[PDB]
């Protein structure tokens, strides 16, 4: 059974953004809430409907009126950006109910342009009969980027694996394409280029044998 | 305080899981202990929790397969899950609980493990390859470079990796891992240090595959 809970939302920063889980088997429960940031385990910030937990600052706040509870989050910062849960104990059935989870995103975060670092393979990889051209793509905002690469100036058709971007503990991203290629496929060009283009912006790294 | 939970890294379908979870900083008699997993989607599920006296809960859905037990002079808690099933897929985390009971009962997942990742499968452990990536200042800012480890082919998720035996942590970024086509995982973990401490300074990245039980120590050097 998972409790009910708010649709993801978006809250300009200074606002206030409420959050709120709900259910039959809710009733007068007392409703913890738990928060999830990338990169971390979760954390308890409410507990029993109400009680701030330590390192809950006092712009979060908990209460419950009939089979709704609601977290309400005062003066809203992009640190609070992350997902919500909701929890309550049912000693008739003996189980743990949690809610669905809910999606913070704070609005009006800046653009964040990528770093951009190509790696060209290792003398060891070559020696062990392969090799892979790295390039690494980090704190961009927002989490999309498009990802090409060249051998000298043709377009690179085969060989290429990329993540998809990763949010990390900033709040911006990550993303990293690799370029597998024989050793003879790397010497035999004059270079190969990574090119990561980013709202619009472009960077290209190059690295030659 | 949960250490990391302890697990297989991957699981055959129709297997048994099983997870080790270790008290640090204090008694695994003193609380309930319970076991939550979070799924590749970001949700949550309780499966069970426990008391080292045998008061225990499970949850009904898994209560045919589910077993929880505590050892208190290994302060440990361990959770077996038989008969596993591609949903069984998920990140299992350890906690520490509150417990209440007045005119009400209440509990409350107070402090979290950092979760032990289950992988649902029938490939094998694969161990990774580890190649330098050779420090380069031509993308870093003044005085600085990039160095790191290429840590290729391995599955299941994840690899841990430290520099320096965990001397070195300013300017660490591990990258999440690719997968690839074949089904293995690789990644890169880079390093941005002081250009003048390429002399003078070391630097190993240790790289712990525990489902393989492989590990490495490699130098990188310009």
Known sequence: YVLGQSSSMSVAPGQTAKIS?????????????????????????????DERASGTPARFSGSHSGSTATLTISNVVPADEADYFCQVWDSKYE?????????????????????????????????????????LISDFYPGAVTVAWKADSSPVKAGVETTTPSKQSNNKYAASSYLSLTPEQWKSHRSYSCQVTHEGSTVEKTVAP | ???????????????????????????????????????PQGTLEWIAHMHHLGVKYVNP???????????????????????????????????????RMSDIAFFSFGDWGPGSLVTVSSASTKGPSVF?????????????????????????????????????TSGVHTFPAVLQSSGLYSLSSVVTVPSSSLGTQTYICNVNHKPSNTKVDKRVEP
């Open chain 2, 132 to 168: 330098p990536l050779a420090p380069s200042s031509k993308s870093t800012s003044g005085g600085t470079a990039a160095l790191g480890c290429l840590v290729k082919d391995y599955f299941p998720e994840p690899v841990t990796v430290s520099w320096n035996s965990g001397a070195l």
């Open chain 2, 61 to 99: 859905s898994l209560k045919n397969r589910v077993s929880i037990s505590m050892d208190t002079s290994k302060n440990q808690m361990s959770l077996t899950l038989k008969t596993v099933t591609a949903t069984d897929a998920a990140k299992y985390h350890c906690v520490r609980m509150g417990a």
């Open chain 1, 95 to 135: 189980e743990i109910y949690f809610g669905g989870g809910t999606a913070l995103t704070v609005l009006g975060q800046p653009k964040a342009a990528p770093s951009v670092t190509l790696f060209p393979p290792s003398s060891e990889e070559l020696q062990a009969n392969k090799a892979t051209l790295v390039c």
């Open chain 1, 21 to 49: 889980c709900w259910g039959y088997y809710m009733g007068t429960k007392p409703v913890n809430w738990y928060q999830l940031k990338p990169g971390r385990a979760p954390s308890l910030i409410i507990s029993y409907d």
């Open chain 2, 1 to 39: 305080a949960p250490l990391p939970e302890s697990g297989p890294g991957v699981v055959r379908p129709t297997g048994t899981l099983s997870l080790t979870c270790t008290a640090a900083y204090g008694s695994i008699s003193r609380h309930f202990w319970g076991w939550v997993r979070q799924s």
